């Protein structure tokens, strides 16, 4: 399995410095080009950087040039990206991905990408989530992830072990700057006193994670 | 003469063969082309290689019609 | 060196979709095209022009010639819904169409499912409360999201999300009303009203009931 894993996001501040990595795994890593793209939120696809096998030749985006420095650790399976002198209109989902092409044919495409990583560049600081349990009445039941910033929060229910029936939806966006969102599960009426149901809600930026247990009444 | 192209067409139907030695000619009856990676670039990796830089082509002509 | 695409492409269900990606001389170039669902990581769909990666449905096809790249989609079908992006390669710079968001029109229309959840007893007992509204299912994706103290329109402490699309290609939303404890008990009861293609579905909590 050819799988890219970004790590390194979260919030900065203006002017401040990140630096991304992304581990490689399933594919000979010290023989292929790499790169890294972003997406701002609501927007489109930006290339940002490449590095070939022996990092011998390195390209940027203009937008990106002398500020940002991409580099890689082949005995190490990974891709860097340094983030100098940071700006707000650098956040976006940051990328990693291979480039399994043909160079000799000047063919190029990106193959696998990365689950990307959200860099948020703002003066505000982070907040971790008030979580709540939406108690059931199958039968409807959730966690209410109330006021943290900046995004994003991920929910899984049970460790992971409960995927049927999960409904995660998007976060709002508050007048007071922070989110809030909600996740519930639908599950049998009958399983309401045997199994436990537990939301793990992880808010990474703040380092926060909060496992609760939502229970009938 | 055929356009750039058509010959990095060539290029990626034997990227599993491309190398420093001259490739079979792309046709087996007419006028076709045999592609090569430049002696000199022979050192590069395949991702190091751009076809403006480190390409050769030649024309072969088949007789097997 | 710039790639220009059409920012949206609609399509009945069944039929063919044409997303074009064009560029001075764009097919002396390898083009490729990704597809990105909301909330995912993009996926290549077409490659070198023409090919198809092992996995991507047969209907996807490409072809690139001229100042033109063309992603054809023939019998569209719900689950195709997404933007679609364009890449190809310049002087060592990588460079992407500004992305085309496909449309699969005539969808079957679905009234939203409504779930309200009162304020918790955690919550209420640290002083504050939250009335949850989540409504999904619905189809087409536009919703009025309206919310009642008794039967007063309530015009404060509301926040309600547009809405997104659900893997199954239809809608969700959500809408929160934050209010006090002594509001919430104090009140006979309060209502969540979704409307959709003109009609109504209306849930209602009150703190005097489990």
Same mark, same amino acid.
């Given at each position: ?9 979260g919030?900065?501040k ?7 990595? !992304?581990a ?5 890593f010290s #023989? ?10 609501? /927007?489109?696809?930006?290339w940002?950087?490449?590095?070939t #096998?022996s990092? #011998? ?8 040039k ?15 990206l340094?983030?100098?002198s940071?700006?707000?209109e650098?956040?976006?989902?940051y990328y990693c991905?291979?480039d ?19 860099v ?9 989530p008030?979580?709540?349990?939406l ?7 959730? !966690?209410?992830? /109330?006021?943290?910033?900046?995004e994003?929060?991920t ?6 072990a409960?995927?049927s ?7 709002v ?5 922070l ?19 537990? !939301?793990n809600?992880?808010?990474?930026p703040?380092?926060?994670k909060?496992? /609760? ?5 | ?24 000619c792309?046709?087996?009856?007419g006028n ?22 480190d ?9 097997k019609? | 060196?710039? =790639?220009t695409?059409?920012? $949206? ?5 069944? &039929?063919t ?8 001389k ?8 990704y &597809?990105?669902?909301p909330g995912?990581?993009?996926?290549v ?8 990666? *092992? ?5 996807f *096809?490409?072809?690139?010639?001229? +100042? @033109?790249? @063309?992603?054809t ?7 195709? %819904? ?9 002087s ?11 449309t699969?029109?005539?969808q079957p ?11 918790? *007893?955690?919550?209420?007992?640290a ?15 536009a919703? @009025? ?10 015009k404060?402490?509301? %926040?309600?999300?547009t809405?997104?699309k659900?893997? +199954? +290609? ?6 929160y009303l *934050? =209010?006090?404890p002594?509001?919430?008990?104090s ?11 003109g $009609?109504?579905? %209306?849930?209602t909590?009150?703190?005097? %009931?489990?």
């Amino acid at each position: 399995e050819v799988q890219l894993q970004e790590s390194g996001g979260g919030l900065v501040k203006p002017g401040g410095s990140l630096r991304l990595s !992304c581990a490689a795994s399933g594919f000979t890593f010290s #023989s292929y080009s790499m790169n890294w793209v972003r997406q701002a939120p609501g /927007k489109g696809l930006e290339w940002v950087s490449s590095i070939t #096998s022996s990092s #011998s030749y390195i390209y940027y985006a203009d937008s990106v040039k002398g500020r940002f420095t991409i580099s890689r650790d082949n005995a190490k399976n990974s891709l860097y990206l340094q983030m100098n002198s940071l700006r707000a209109e650098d956040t976006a989902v940051y990328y990693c991905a291979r480039d399994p092409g043909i160079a000799a044919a000047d063919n190029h495409w990106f193959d696998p990408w990365g689950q990307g990583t959200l860099v948020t560049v703002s003066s505000a600081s982070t907040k971790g989530p008030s979580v709540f349990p939406l108690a059931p009445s199958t039968a409807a039941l959730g !966690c209410l992830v /109330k006021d943290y910033f900046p995004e994003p929060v991920t929910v899984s229910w049970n460790s992971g072990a409960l995927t049927s029936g999960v409904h995660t939806f998007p976060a709002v966006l508050q007048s007071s700057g922070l989110y809030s969102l909600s996740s519930v599960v639908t599950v049998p009426s009958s399983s309401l006193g045997t199994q436990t149901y537990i !939301c793990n809600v992880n808010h990474k930026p703040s380092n926060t994670k909060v496992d /609760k247990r939502v229970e009938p009444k | 003469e055929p356009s750039d192209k058509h010959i990095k067409e060539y290029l990626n139907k034997i990227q599993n063969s491309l190398s420093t030695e001259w490739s079979p000619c792309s046709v087996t009856c007419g006028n076709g082309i045999q592609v090569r990676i430049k002696p000199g670039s022979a050192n590069k990796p395949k991702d190091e290689l751009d076809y403006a830089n480190d390409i050769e082509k030649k024309i072969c002509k088949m007789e097997k019609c | 060196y710039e =790639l220009t695409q059409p920012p $949206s492409v609609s399509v009945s269900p069944g &039929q063919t979709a044409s997303i074009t990606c064009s560029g001075d001389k764009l097919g002396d170039k390898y083009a490729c095209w990704y &597809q990105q669902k909301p909330g995912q990581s993009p996926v290549v769909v077409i490659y070198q022009d023409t090919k198809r990666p *092992s996995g991507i449905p047969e209907r996807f *096809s490409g072809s690139n010639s001229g +100042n @033109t790249a @063309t992603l054809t989609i023939s019998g569209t079908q719900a689950m195709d %819904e997404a933007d679609y992006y364009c890449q190809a390669w310049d002087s060592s710079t990588v460079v992407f169409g500004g992305g085309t968001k496909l449309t699969v029109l005539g969808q079957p229309k679905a009234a939203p499912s409504v779930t309200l959840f009162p304020p918790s *007893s955690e919550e209420l007992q640290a002083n504050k409360a939250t009335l949850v509204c989540l409504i999904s299912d619905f189809y087409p994706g536009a919703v @009025t999201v309206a919310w009642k103290a008794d039967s007063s329109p309530v015009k404060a402490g509301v %926040e309600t999300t547009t809405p997104s699309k659900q893997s +199954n +290609n239809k809608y969700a939303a959500s809408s929160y009303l *934050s =209010l006090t404890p002594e509001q919430w008990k104090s009140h006979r009861s309060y209502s969540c009203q979704v409307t959709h293609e003109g $009609s109504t579905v %209306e849930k209602t909590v009150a703190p005097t %009931e489990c």
